[PDB]
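HOLO CASE FILE
Compound: calcium ion
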Amino acid sequence: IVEGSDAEIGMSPWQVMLFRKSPQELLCGASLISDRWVLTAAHCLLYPPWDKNFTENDLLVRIGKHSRTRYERNIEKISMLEKIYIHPRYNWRENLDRDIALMKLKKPVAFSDYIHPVCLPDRETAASLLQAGYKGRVTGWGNLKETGQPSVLQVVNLPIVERPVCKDSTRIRITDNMFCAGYKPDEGKRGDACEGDSGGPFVMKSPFNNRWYQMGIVSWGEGCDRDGKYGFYTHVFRLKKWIQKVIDQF
Amino acid sequence: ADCGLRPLFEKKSLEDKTERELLESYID
Amino acid sequence: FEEIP
Ligand SMILES: CCc1cc(OCC(C)(C)CN(C)C)c(F)c([C@@H](Nc2ccc(C(=N)N)cc2)C(=O)O)c1
Ligand SMILES: [Ca+2]
Ligand code: NA
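Model generated. Tokens follow.
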């Protein structure tokens, strides 16, 4: 996260760290959506152009974390993966269209002060909140700058951007399964996700029921926090039928 | 049933330092 | 990263 701030304790209790076993390193963020299921970006697990193809045994999921590098004894929980499910129409060839995957945990994780699931939006939530200017929140342990690494989870609040402005900012083809967020040059304020943040949540707090909903997944971007560029996010609601299908079946 | 209600915030009626920024942006 | 047990 570039130009964000340190999270408060328990500020993002759905935050999950995707952790590579060997070598030991941060792969991506992710989010807890029940005691058994974790949501992340497909590209965190599968990206053939760069020979990325992680299997269940390659990684661990770390939940309840605040510190990036510490083993947070008596606080974080480490879970193994039973199965990965990548969207069958995930487009890694071109533009990361449908950049979404689910991970089933081998065992249910116990909820605590530091571990608690986020809500997924329904149609009405999404219609009400997914509006240009409306702000959401992005969290992660990724790079502090495009060109280093945080001590603790970082947080930034960013406004959703009008679709034509998103389109006009890039040569990449933008689909309905994506939205973009970030401040405009004329807006003065800064902030963005960066390397290491992909797969993490873009959340909004409903003013109707005071619940946090995950509207996006950190997906892609060109550099980090550049003027006239915006972060791109997987549109969770648009892909929710897939999410439901997978959990209902497996 | 309890999704998106944080033990250390919503559940005990405490607000985090910047959530009000989000509320102020939800204008419509 | 600190070692995990
Ligand atoms: C491992 C696969 C991968 C693919 C990415 O994009 C692919 C593509 C074709 C959409 C464009 N590419 C030229 C960046 C990509 F951005 C990443 C990239 N993800 C990323 C996400 C958000 C931001 C931001 N908000 N500034 C920046 C970077 C990364 O971690 O390298 C990773
Ligand atoms: Ca364009
Ligand atoms: Na920018």
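CASE NOTES: The longest helix of chain A spans residues 240-249. Residues 13-117+238-249 of chain A form a domain with the Thrombin, subunit H fold (CATH 2.40.10.10).
CLOSED: yes
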